[PDB]
From Swiss-Prot, chain B:
Recorded superkingdom: Eukaryota
Coiled coil: none
The name this protein goes by in its record: DNA-directed RNA polymerase I subunit RPA135
Disulphides: none
Residues of the full protein shown: 918 to 974 of 1203
Phylogenetic classification of the source organism: Eukaryota, Fungi, Dikarya, Ascomycota, Saccharomycotina
Anything else known: Three distinct zinc-containing RNA polymerases are found in eukaryotic nuclei: polymerase I for the ribosomal RNA precursor, polymerase II for the mRNA precursor, and polymerase III for 5S and tRNA genes.
Protein family membership: Belongs to the RNA polymerase beta chain family.
Curated annotation (Swiss-Prot), chain F:
Binding site for Zn(2+) 1: C9, C12, C29, C32
Keywords: DNA-directed RNA polymerase, Metal-binding, Nucleus, Ribosome biogenesis, Transcription, Zinc, Zinc-finger
Cited function: DNA-dependent RNA polymerases catalyze the transcription of DNA into RNA using the four ribonucleoside triphosphates as substrates. Component of RNA polymerase I (Pol I) which synthesizes ribosomal RNA precursors. Besides, RNA polymerase I has intrinsic RNA cleavage activity. Proposed to contribute to the polymerase catalytic activity and form the polymerase active center together with the two largest subunits. Subunit RPA12 contributes a catalytic zinc ribbon that is required for RNA cleavage by Pol I. Involved in transcriptional termination.
GO molecular function: DNA-directed RNA polymerase activity; nucleic acid binding; RNA polymerase II-specific DNA-binding transcription factor binding; zinc ion binding
Cysteines engaged in disulfide bonds, as pairs: none
GO biological process assignments: negative regulation of transcription by RNA polymerase II; nucleolar large rRNA transcription by RNA polymerase I; ribosome biogenesis; termination of RNA polymerase I transcription; transcription by RNA polymerase I; transcription elongation by RNA polymerase I; transcription initiation at RNA polymerase I promoter
Note: Present with 8450 molecules/cell in log phase SD medium.
CDD domains (UniProt xref): Zn-ribbon_RPA12
SUPFAM superfamilies membership: Zinc beta-ribbon (SSF57783)
Annotated segments matching region Interaction with RPA2: 1-59
Curated annotation (Swiss-Prot), chain I:
Residue span of region Bridging helix: 160-172
Misc remark: Present with 2840 molecules/cell in log phase SD medium.
Similarity remark: Belongs to the RNA polymerase beta' chain family.
Subcellular location: Nucleus, Nucleolus
First and last residues shown, out of full length: 833 to 1028 of 1664
Organism of provenance: Saccharomyces cerevisiae (strain ATCC 204508 / S288c) (Baker's yeast)
Protein name: DNA-directed RNA polymerase I subunit RPA190
Subunit structure: Component of the RNA polymerase I (Pol I) complex consisting of 14 subunits: RPA135, RPA190, RPC40, RPA14, RPB5, RPO26, RPA43, RPB8, RPA12, RPB10, RPC19, RPC10, RPA49 and RPA34. The complex is composed of a horseshoe-shaped core containing ten subunits (RPA135, RPA190, RPB5, RPO26, RPB8, RPB10, RPC10, RPA12, RPC19 and RPC40) where RPA135 and RPA190 form the DNA-binding cleft. Outside of the core, RPA14 and RPA43 form the stalk that mediates interactions with transcription initiation factors and newly synthesized RNA.
Transmembrane segments: none
Primary gene name: RPA190
Residues annotated with Phosphoserine modification: S57
From Swiss-Prot, chain K:
Record Gene3D superfamilies: Homeodomain-like
PROSITE patterns found in the cross-reference section: RNA_POL_N_8KD
Main location class: nucleus
GO MF term set: DNA binding; DNA-directed RNA polymerase activity; zinc ion binding
Protein name, per record: DNA-directed RNA polymerases I, II, and III subunit RPABC5
Subcellular location field: Nucleus, Nucleolus
Additional record remark: Present with 5300 molecules/cell in log phase SD medium.
Gene giving rise to this polypeptide: RPB10
Length: 630, 57, 107, 369, 57, 124, 100, 46, 196, 115, 69
């Protein structure tokens, strides 16, 4: 860990040992990163396979992926039926359970039925589309469940129907189970002691549903790289590790209950009884975590929020160094999307500018599916101090979300990390978003970290749902640009980037449009797509192919080769540096791993033996050693 | 392969003497066919060829 | 366009309710006004009740930290206002008739 | 064409050669006479004022101007009267009593019961868990060292429609797909004439809920009626009921034919293109169409109407469209031999298990599949 | 220039009598056993299409 | 309080029962015990319009201000080159580029004739 | 000049590996997504994500099938027994060592 | 047409019906003696 | 590969006439007139209307594509035989295209003149939700270059914006690489068992 | 009531002179972030437009009106009782909002775009 | 690894000029241009073989399995 290149040499490693991979039965394997939906932000998806689920389901819907503070996900879809009925979908074990939304909303807090009506219909009281869809929702509940007159009596009801499925205990009352359903499922990025904020978000998510079915909100594309983030390696590794030490607590219960299926000897205050129980449970969890890394098979009876069960870990290859340093810079959309033959997910988009490399993707079957990150694209690792941001929005023009009672696209819902904190206008919203960017890159205000992304979305005729979204959490995608006031550095994510104006060179900065400029136009490329010499002169399928040819060269795997035991190593003997090279060749230290040699090359058709991609090597060059390798 | 996606197999280890020598006396190590260039448009290789010769001199 | 100040008042006399749109209680009602003793902009609690309805309210633990509200009283002659540092009681209303539960498990 | 012998092509067409003395104005007006007109296509707005007391729904329709939809569709305003009063409200009051029957019966699920699966496929949950990440220089390394040009599951719906057909019996659980089918039992105008008052009287007397009706016969610009339903009923999204029924109510559809269009001619052939096949109905339009020259790509329709030799010549003409589009010139001697093999029984057989059945040699049959 | 790791050293084979299979008495699959080049389904159709009956036999 | 076709209580904010599904002139709250047998708010209208994107037709597209339909001959690919069409001696011919095969294959150029209209296929 | 190969700086670094700090710091910023992700399991606020995660799965309980043997009251018949509640409150990955 | 753990024992009927099996693998698609394969190479002098 | 100094003077001036082409097409499609300026707010309302429809905005991507493809074929028609430094026999680049040895006149034009309109899925460059085709461009930028018209060439280089759009068109053919394989395999077997 | 501890109740409230005459009275609901001390501010520049440039102790302040629910409460005589202001609820007349602003600087376009 | 003995292209003996070249850049503080011409490397096929050498052997020699540490 805290170790010098001199000490890595003495302890039988390379002097620039990179790490980041597990050694499992000798084979070096690593956890592949993924692309999943951005956390804590209600997307506005339309999807044709919701009417394939049941009768009168529309294709409309609101989908939120809520993460807990231990990085465990929970996805809640909010459907729209053609009745006017609105439901609430979740998945608890591997099953899939639906509930009416006013059964949640009247269980989250004590609600007058107009505070449901006012929370959705904030103003725009006289909108005929909207005040009619909602009196099929309050009326349709009071009709169907007429014996629910307050908050506890629906928690009595909901904990009764959901008692067996949560494997709840016979001492728990129904409002202890029914409270646990609302603490384990709905909008869990707010947690316990956050019932009012889980109630403000669902009323936001209902107007976003109703403003989607009215065609006032463009549907959010879940491939558009502003609505998706990175599931990191070790974060997955501690999501599966929680579920294995949850099965360990269940096998203790399953072992004690198989002692009261018999009648042997049970006193739960006996120390020697406990050791008899715990010597029988298979407690070798580190073999269940090795088996994940050994195979890739995510096996969990609990069921994680990810929709495949394979390919989570891959073999870190060492056929050269360019192959190896590109595994750690590789991201993937998921194994579920290669099954399709609709090629929308494979298409390169403008919102991947500086986050995903346009060049460095594999030719062939994972073309578009297996893109790599760009050069200066840093992924967030921990979250930031956001407990001081609400006090700074209140110093600005924000009226709080506890007093205002006003919703819909006519205003600018200020949210940080998926918690609605207040409401402003749209003209005030752009001033708040811009002063926060000036207070961020000017590092004077204590509560603004530089990694906070300020996602202002201005209003527009039938565009994206306007608001002001601020994110600071884990696993985001960040890259630096130069803010044009102060000539500082600004950390910009992909949700921000759609509505900003980032000039490429300084010479192209036009007046009164650009607030940001790139540091270098080479920051949008990969590592390996950036080492192609003069790569703006080739045709684009030829830059993408060097990114596949260069991984498969035989070069230098490393210099500590007398202390390893690998299935295959290819090693080029006589490497040379390039005379023609990029300056990022030196910054990554690719001289330690010479991949290739210089050759006096004559472009000539002389022999007749070279057509159709054939080449002629010199014989005496070969005899004197020329690309010799073992 | 060069660094521009111009891969090709070795067709023949061609002997030294019957291979075009230069005014300088240099004989090339690799002969590449000029017909591989129009269909591929790798002009990053035509500029690498005279940037690596200026840099060697 | 300037307007001066009549007077400055600190002590809690005036409060502001935050109810649903159209909360029109029977006007024979009194309100309790509580205050947690911690010597800054403190968190206040409402309570008030008639024979049929009953309600408590409270201030927001987050937004009462660094956002503060003032009630002003303007004489158009004198072109100056007097100030009264008022909280906001974010309040709900419960029904005294309907507070029943059931057998708390399936038994 | 070659496989599966499609009786139902997904996009059937019909080429209608117009005469030499018909003109282009006369031909575009003719396309408007054949092309179907949904009642949705002549409506600008529907303004539903719902009031209560009996739930008195008032439906006001705003058409486009009469000089506009009579150019765009050649639809007279008398035909709007003769579709609203005789087809629309029969569909509208059918959708209402269906929706009140939904109101009393089914309004709530069972909370706590798991619904079935969400987004998995019918099989294997993915294409391949490991081989789906093989690049074309690595996947051509696995298809060079072995004879691996085959695909186990060739991944086709026509293969699946060749896997799914030819049902079990008529003595099954459902003999004719039987179900219940039971348990039924601005402006401010007035001053109609005697005619529109008496048209309204038999319109109310022949529908279930009409109770008032009017139609703008002077301009053809609006329509108006007042569905006054029961008082027991509750809130009902009437505008979503109307938008479905307007998109389904046909004004003028020649059957099996959706839309005709007059494209740019190839080599002096002034023709039409008809999205759908109905040979029997185009025979009665001989004042505009040379009926002895109409050409389809639905081979199973030319077989049914013009015999087996015209079905043969359609096969060689429609295989050639597939190759001449890509500028690929196969010979006609190869296309004649396939079309003579597909029509060797006098029917339209394809190359599949069902076509292969009528054959002499059994080792050809056993070795196929 | 660069040199790629996938090389043509593990490609060729030649068969003259070889080991056979036990059920069908046909030549055996395997570059390790050095036998079994496959005249498959499509290569049979080429030999019918030439009309040569004794190259198919 | 009356908002739209809805009516709410002034005490518990509760949605009142539909004033014509009940017996004669007595509606009350269920959380509160409301005092409305007066039925003072009877007649309620909700004027609702269909959507402006609800009935799509070719006549509505002409009511748009932007152009919604290219005409018979408003599309001519100007990307032309003097590739000789030999079936009539035509020089001007349209073109269009892609990369279909693996990325070790030359560019695929898609030609299109102008006068005779006879198509051509060019691999490399 | 335009670029330079660092042909005395390379050779002085091959012979003498750096004793204080790694050269080429952009190569350790390439895997900071991977290493920092694993570091958050055992470090950061709340003792990492694993100690913060074992409390989201708090209690797995059962009961016995034996009475309290109290007086004849209504809690004597509808009674399960004494109640264990097994829990995990701290998880600690050690470091690779070896033992014999 | 019998019952099987996950994938039961193959019967004599199911040894016959796919691309593999018998009737297409060993009757239309036999492997031959006196054959060879190799990488090909260009030559203008033949 | 190099043009002569006269011929390199021509293509600068012919491409100087395409700086005002993305707006003449954008004002034609919206049925405005008299050359409304690019930042006219009524135009920016109209261009947002054709951003939200898919049967529109291929209208703008067929008008503006044809209106810049003319400037593409005016540069080719004046430069590649006559503005080159080396004429036909000695220019081996042209002599490999005219012979049919390897290449075409399209390949020679993208080297010496300009790449041109990089057209995606038949239409043109895709746009964001914000009316921006890259983060470097103004929203609803009426320009040929913002719509993906590469005025650069492979001899001199393509700018970082138009480098990116050519990477989009390089990928849309490469998704039709894997769907090629098992199309006609089963179709030909099923023919060759009957016609056998 | 007052179930979590610490909730001192209030007894010695002052009298808010809401007259109800007919000179006249207007009841406002001005707003402040807590960073400014209200005794130390003396005037209050307020306009019906946003033209409300105020600056206190090197801090740019901005008073914003928003004309287009919150209920005023006043004590009875001395006991708390906080009864609802009305005439027969009370809607206010004007609501204001002090907002701290900053001046983002003009981009020095001469230095920042080098040819 | 170690310096090649001969030039690949022409064939002039190059492997005796690597330790001389590192003195011409350290002691004499010359550029790469004059340090090659003083050693007699005058054809650019053999100038590019001293100029471009990586000398990876000094990185391999640090892993000695035949001595302690």
């Amino acid at each position: 860990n805290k170790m010098s290149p001199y000490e890595l040499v003495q302890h039988k490693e390379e002097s620039d040992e990179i790490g980041g991979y597990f050694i499992v039965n000798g084979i070096e394997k690593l956890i592949r990163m993924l692309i999943v939906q951005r956390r804590n932000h209600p997307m506005a998806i339309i999807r044709p396979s919701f009417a394939n689920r049941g009768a009168s389901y529309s294709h409309y819907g609101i989908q939120i992926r809520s993460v807990r503070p231990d990085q465990t996900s929970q996805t809640n879809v909010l459907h729209y039926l053609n009745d006017g009925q609105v439901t609430f979908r979740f998945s608890w074990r591997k099953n899939e359970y639906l509930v009416p939304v006013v059964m949640i909303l009247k269980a989250l807090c004590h609600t007058s039925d107009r505070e449901i009506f006012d929370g959705i219909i904030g103003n725009d009281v006289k909108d005929s589309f909207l005040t009619d869809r909602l009196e099929l929702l309050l009326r349709g509940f009071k009709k169907r469940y007429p014996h629910l007159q307050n908050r506890t009596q629906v928690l009595q009801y909901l904990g009764d129907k959901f008692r067996v499925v949560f494997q709840a205990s016979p001492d728990q009352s129904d409002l202890e189970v029914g409270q646990e359903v609302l603490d384990r499922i709905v909008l869990v990025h707010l947690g316990k002691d956050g019932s009012q904020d889980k109630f403000r978000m669902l009323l936001f998510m209902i107007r976003k549903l109703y403003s989607l079915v009215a065609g006032e909100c463009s549907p959010d594309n879940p491939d558009a790289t502003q609505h998706q983030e990175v599931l990191l390696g070790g974060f997955l590794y501690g999501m599966i590790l929680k579920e294995k030490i949850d099965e360990y607590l269940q096998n203790i219960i399953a072992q004690v209950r198989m002692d009261i299926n018999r009648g042997m000897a049970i006193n739960f205050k006996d120390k020697r009884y406990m050791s008899r129980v715990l010597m029988r449970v298979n407690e070798n969890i580190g073999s269940k975590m090795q088996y994940f890394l050994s195979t890739g098979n995510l096996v969990s009876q609990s069921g994680l929020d990810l929709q495949q069960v394979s390919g989570y870990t891959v073999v870190a290859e060492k056929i050269n160094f360019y192959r190896f340093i590109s595994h750690f810079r590789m991201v993937h959309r998921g194994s579920f999307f290669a099954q399709l033959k609709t090629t929308t997910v494979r298409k390169l988009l403008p919102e991947s500018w500086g986050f995903l490399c346009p060049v460095h993707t594999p030719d062939g079957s994972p073309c578009g599916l297996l893109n790599h990150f760009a050069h200066k694209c840093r992924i967030s690792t921990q979250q930031s101090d956001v407990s001081r941001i609400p006090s700074i929005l209140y110093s600005l023009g924000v009226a709080p979300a506890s007093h205002t009672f006003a919703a819909g696209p006519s205003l600018c819902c200020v949210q940080i990390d998926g918690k609605i904190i207040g409401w402003v206008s749209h003209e005030q919203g752009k001033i708040i978003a811009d002063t926060l960017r000036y207070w961020k890159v000017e590092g004077k205000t204590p509560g603004l970290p530089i990694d906070l992304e300020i996602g202002y979305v201005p209003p527009s005729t039938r565009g994206q749902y306007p608001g002001l979204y601020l994110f600071g959490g884990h696993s985001r995608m960040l890259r630096p640009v130069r803010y044009l006031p102060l000539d500082k550095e600004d950390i910009v994510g992909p949700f921000e980037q759609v509505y900003m104006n980032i000039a490429v060179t300084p010479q192209e900065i036009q007046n009164n449009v650009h607030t940001h400029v790139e540091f270098t136009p080479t920051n949008i490329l990969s590592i390996l797509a950036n080492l192609t010499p003069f790569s703006d002169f080739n045709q684009s399928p030829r830059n993408m192919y060097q990114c596949q040819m260069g991984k498969q060269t035989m070069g230098t795997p490393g210099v500590a080769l007398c202390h390893r035991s690998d299935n295959k190593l290819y090693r080029l003997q006589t490497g040379q540096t390039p005379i023609v090279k990029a300056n990022l060749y030196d910054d990554y230290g690719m001289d330690n791993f010479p991949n290739g040699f210089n050759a006096v090359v004559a472009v000539i058709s002389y022999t007749g033996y070279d057509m159709d991609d054939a080449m002629i090597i010199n014989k005496s060059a070969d005899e004197r050693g020329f690309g010799y390798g073992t | 392969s060069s660094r521009h996606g111009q891969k090709g197999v070795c067709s023949r280890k061609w002997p030294t003497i019957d291979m075009p020598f230069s005014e300088t006396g240099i004989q090339p190590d690799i002969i590449i066919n000029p017909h591989a260039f129009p269909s591929r448009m790798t002009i990053g290789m035509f500029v690498e060829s005279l940037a690596g010769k200026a840099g060697a001199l | 366009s300037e307007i001066e100040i009549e007077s400055v008042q600190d002590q809690p006399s005036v409060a502001v309710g935050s109810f649903f749109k159209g909360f029109r209680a029977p006007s024979d009602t009194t309100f309790d006004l509580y205050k947690k003793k911690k010597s800054e902009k403190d968190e206040f609690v409402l309570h008030g009740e008639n024979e049929r309805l009953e309600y408590e309210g409270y201030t927001d633990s987050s937004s009462q930290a660094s956002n503060q509200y003032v009630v002003g009283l303007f004489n158009p002659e004198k072109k100056s206002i007097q100030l009264y540092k008022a909280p906001v009681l974010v309040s709900k209303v419960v029904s005294k008739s309907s507070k029943n539960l059931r057998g708390p498990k399936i038994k | 064409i070659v496989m599966t012998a499609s009786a139902a092509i997904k996009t059937p067409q019909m080429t209608l050669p117009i005469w030499n003395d018909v003109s282009d104005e006369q031909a575009d007006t003719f396309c408007k006479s054949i092309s179907k007109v949904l009642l949705s296509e002549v409506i600008d707005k529907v303004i539903v004022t719902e009031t209560t007391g009996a739930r008195s729904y008032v439906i006001h329709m705003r058409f486009f101007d009469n000089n506009e939809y009579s150019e765009e569709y050649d639809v007279s305003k008398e035909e709007l009267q003769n579709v609203i009063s005789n087809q629309f409200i029969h569909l509208l009051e059918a959708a209402i009593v269906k929706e009140i029957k939904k109101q009393k019966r089914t309004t709530g699920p069972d909370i706590g019961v798991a619904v079935p699966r969400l987004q998995t496929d019918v099989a294997n949950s993915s294409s391949n868990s490991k081989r789906l990440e093989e690049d074309n220089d690595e996947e051509q390394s696995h298809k060079k060292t072995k004879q691996a040009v085959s695909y186990d599951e060739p991944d086709e719906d026509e293969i699946e429609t060749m896997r799914e057909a030819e049902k079990s019996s008529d003595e099954e659980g459902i003999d004719s797909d039987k179900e219940s089918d039971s348990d039924s039992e601005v402006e401010a105008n007035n001053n109609m004439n005697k005619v529109q008052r008496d048209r309204q009287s038999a319109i109310i007397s022949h529908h279930r809920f009409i109770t008032k009706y009017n139609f703008d016969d002077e301009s053809g610009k609006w329509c108006e009626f007042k569905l006054e339903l029961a008082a027991d009923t509750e809130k009902l999204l009437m505008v979503n009921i109307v938008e479905e029924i307007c998109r389904k109510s046909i004004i003028r559809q020649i059957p099996h034919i959706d839309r005709c269009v007059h494209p740019e001619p190839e080599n002096g052939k002034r023709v039409l293109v008809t999205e759908g096949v109905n040979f029997q109905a185009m025979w009665d339009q001989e004042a505009f169409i040379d009926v002895d020259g109409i050409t389809s790509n639905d081979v199973a329709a030319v077989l049914k109407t013009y015999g087996v030799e015209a079905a043969r010549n359609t096969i060689v003409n429609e295989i050639n469209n597939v190759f001449s589009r890509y500028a690929i010139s196969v010979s006609f001697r190869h296309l004649d031999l396939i079309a003579d093999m597909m029509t060797r029984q006098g029917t339209y057989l394809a190359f599949n298990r069902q076509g292969m059945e009528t054959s002499t040699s059994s080792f050809m049959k056993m070795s196929y599949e | 220039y660069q040199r790629l790791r996938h090389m043509v050293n593990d490609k060729f084979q030649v068969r003259s009598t070889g080991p056979v299979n036990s059920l069908t008495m046909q030549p055996v699959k395997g570059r390790k056993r050095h036998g079994g080049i496959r005249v498959g389904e499509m290569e049979r159709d080429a030999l019918i299409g030439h009309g040569t009956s004794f190259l198919l036999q | 309080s009356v908002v739209g076709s809805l009516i709410f209580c002034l005490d518990c904010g509760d949605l009142l029962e539909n004033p014509n599904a009940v017996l004669g002139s007595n509606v009350e709250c269920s959380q509160c015990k409301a005092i409305y047998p007066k039925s003072q708010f009877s007649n309620l209208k909700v004027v609702t319009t269909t959507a402006d994107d609800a009935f799509p037709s070719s006549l509505r597209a002409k009511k748009s201000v932007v152009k919604t339909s290219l005409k018979k001959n408003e599309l001519k690919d100007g990307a032309t080159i003097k590739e000789k069409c030999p079936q009539c001696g035509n020089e001007e011919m349209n073109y269009h580029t892609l990369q279909l095969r693996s990325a070790d294959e030359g560019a695929t150029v898609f030609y299109t004739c102008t006068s005779c209209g006879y198509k051509f296929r060019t691999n490399n | 000049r335009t670029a330079d190969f660092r042909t005395l700086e390379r050779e002085s670094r091959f012979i003498n590996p750096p004793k204080d700090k790694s050269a080429f710091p952009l190569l350790q910023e390439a895997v900071q997504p991977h290493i920092g992700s694993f570091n958050a399991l055992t470090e950061g606020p709340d003792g990492g994500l694993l100690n913060l995660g074992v409390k989201d799965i708090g209690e797995k309980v059962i009961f016995d099938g034996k009475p309290l043997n109290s007086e004849d009251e209504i809690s004597n018949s509808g009674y399960l027994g004494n109640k264990l509640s097994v829990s995990v409150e701290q998880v600690s990955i050690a470091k690779p060592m070896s033992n014999d | 047409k019998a019952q099987s753990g996950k994938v039961p024992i193959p019967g004599v009927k199911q040894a016959l019906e796919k691309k593999e099996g018998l009737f297409r693998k060993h009757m239309m698609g036999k492997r031959v003696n006196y054959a060879a394969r190799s990488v090909i190479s260009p030559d203008p002098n033949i | 590969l190099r043009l002569t100094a006269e011929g390199n003077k021509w293509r600068t001036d012919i491409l100087k006439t395409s700086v005002d082409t993305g707006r003449e097409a954008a004002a034609e499609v919206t049925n405005l007139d008299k050359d409304t300026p690019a930042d006219d707010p009524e135009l920016l309302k109209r261009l947002q209307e054709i951003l939200r429809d898919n049967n529109k905005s291929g209208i703008l991507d067929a008008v503006t594509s044809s209106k810049v493809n003319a400037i593409t074929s005016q540069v080719v028609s004046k430069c590649v035989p006559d503005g080159t430094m080396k004429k036909f026999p000695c220019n081996s680049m042209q002599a490999m295209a005219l012979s049919g040895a390897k290449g075409s006149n399209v390949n020679v034009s993208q080297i010496m003149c300009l790449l041109g309109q990089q057209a995606l899925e038949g239409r043109r460059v895709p746009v964001m939700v914000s009316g921006k085709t890259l983060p470097s461009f103004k929203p609803y930028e009426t320009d040929a270059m913002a719509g993906g018209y590469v005025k650069g060439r492979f001899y001199s280089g393509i700018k970082p914006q138009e480098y990116y759009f050519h990477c989009m068109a390089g990928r849309e053919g490469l998704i039709d690489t894997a769907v090629k394989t098992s199309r006609s395999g089963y179709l030909q077997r099923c023919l060759t068992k009957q016609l056998e | 009531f007052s179930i979590p501890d610490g909730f001192k109740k209030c007894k010695h409230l002052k009298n808010f002179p809401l007259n109800g005459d007919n000179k006249q009275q207007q009841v406002w609901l001005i707003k402040f972030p807590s960073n400014v001390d209200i005794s130390k501010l003396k005037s209050l520049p307020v306009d019906f437009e946003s033209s409300t440039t105020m600056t206190i102790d090197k801090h740019d302040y901005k008073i914003m009106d928003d004309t287009d629910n919150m209920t005023l409460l006043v004590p009875s005589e001395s006991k708390e009782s906080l009864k609802i202001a009305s005439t027969a609820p009370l809607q206010f007349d004007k609501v204001f909002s002090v907002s701290e602003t900053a001046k983002i600087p003009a981009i020095d376009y001469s230095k920042v775009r080098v040819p | 690894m170690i310096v090649p003995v001969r030039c690949f292209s022409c064939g002039k003996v190059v492997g005796d000029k690597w330790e001389s070249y590192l003195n011409l850049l350290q002691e004499d503080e010359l550029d790469e241009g004059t340090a090659l011409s003083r050693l007699g490397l005058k054809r650019y096929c053999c100038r590019r073989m001293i100029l471009t050498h990586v000398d990876l052997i000094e990185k391999f020699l640090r892993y000695n399995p035949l001595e302690k540490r």
